[PDB]
């Protein structure tokens, strides 16, 4: 709401400035305001939105992992009772992380996904939906954990189905979707074999399509292919 008085173009301009200044919280707030203008986002604008929130939530995830590790050690036998503070602060960071994920999911649901008809936009947003449900799953422990995991899976699966029908195997969005869905299988769904199979098949099918690409497209696709290979090396 606080961006309601700022022009759409000004919000986009300031998001780019915020990125240059490494002010990712500001960047995300500007892009949220841009989305809330109600118009569809161009390719560049979609990537500004994703970069901003990925940086914000990435920092929260890193902090949550540090605090969770300290909390785990505090609860091993022989450790000294140091009070509720570690749990409280881990919970504070966790709640803020969940709030960011809920905000992103809310933008996707109101109304980016429903207006996205082209494969490049729709797959991009469904990948985001899977990613932010995955981040919620990383911290989930309650009655709803299985439903959170299934929400991530469902969004990734719809994105996968569209990407395989509508994009070449080297399309970087298709590749990044596969990379992340493979990580979902390995880290969230306790399915390392599915993770490895998906990464391998994605890599091999992309390899076979590189011959169709310009030098610049080749650079983009091979960059993500190397991430798939990096994960395969980690996992095998």
């Amino acid at each position: 709401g606080a961006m309601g008085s700022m022009e759409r173009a000004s919000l986009i301009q300031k998001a780019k400035l915020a990125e240059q200044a490494e002010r990712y919280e500001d960047m995300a707030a500007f892009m949220k305001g841009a989305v809330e203008k109600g118009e569809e986002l161009s390719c560049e604008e979609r990537n500004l939105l994703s970069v901003a929130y990925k940086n914000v939530v990435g920092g929260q995830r890193a902090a949550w992992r540090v605090l969770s590790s300290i909390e785990q050690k505090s609860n091993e036998e022989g450790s000294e009772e140091k009070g509720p503070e570690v749990r409280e602060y881990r919970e504070k960071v966790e709640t803020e992380l969940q709030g960011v994920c809920d905000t992103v999911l809310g933008l996707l649901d109101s109304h980016l996904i429903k207006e996205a008809g082209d494969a490049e936009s729709r797959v991009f947003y469904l990948k985001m939906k899977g990613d932010y449900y995955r981040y919620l799953a990383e911290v989930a422990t309650g009655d709803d954990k299985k439903r959170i995991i299934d929400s991530a899976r469902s969004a990734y699966q719809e994105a996968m189905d569209i990407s395989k029908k509508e994009m070449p195997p080297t399309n970087p969005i298709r590749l990044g979707l596969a990379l992340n869905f493979s990580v979902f299988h390995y880290e969230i769904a306790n399915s390392p074999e599915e993770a490895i199979s998906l990464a391998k098949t994605t890599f091999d099918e992309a390899m076979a399509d590189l011959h169709t690409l310009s030098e610049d497209s080749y650079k983009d696709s091979t960059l993500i292919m190397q991430l798939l290979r990096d994960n395969l090396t980690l996992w095998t």
């Binding site: 990613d131 990379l179 880290e187 990096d230 980690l234």
Partner: peptide
């Protein structure tokens, strides 16, 4: 951790 984009 593994790579994601």
């Amino acid at each position: 951790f593994p790579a994601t984009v």
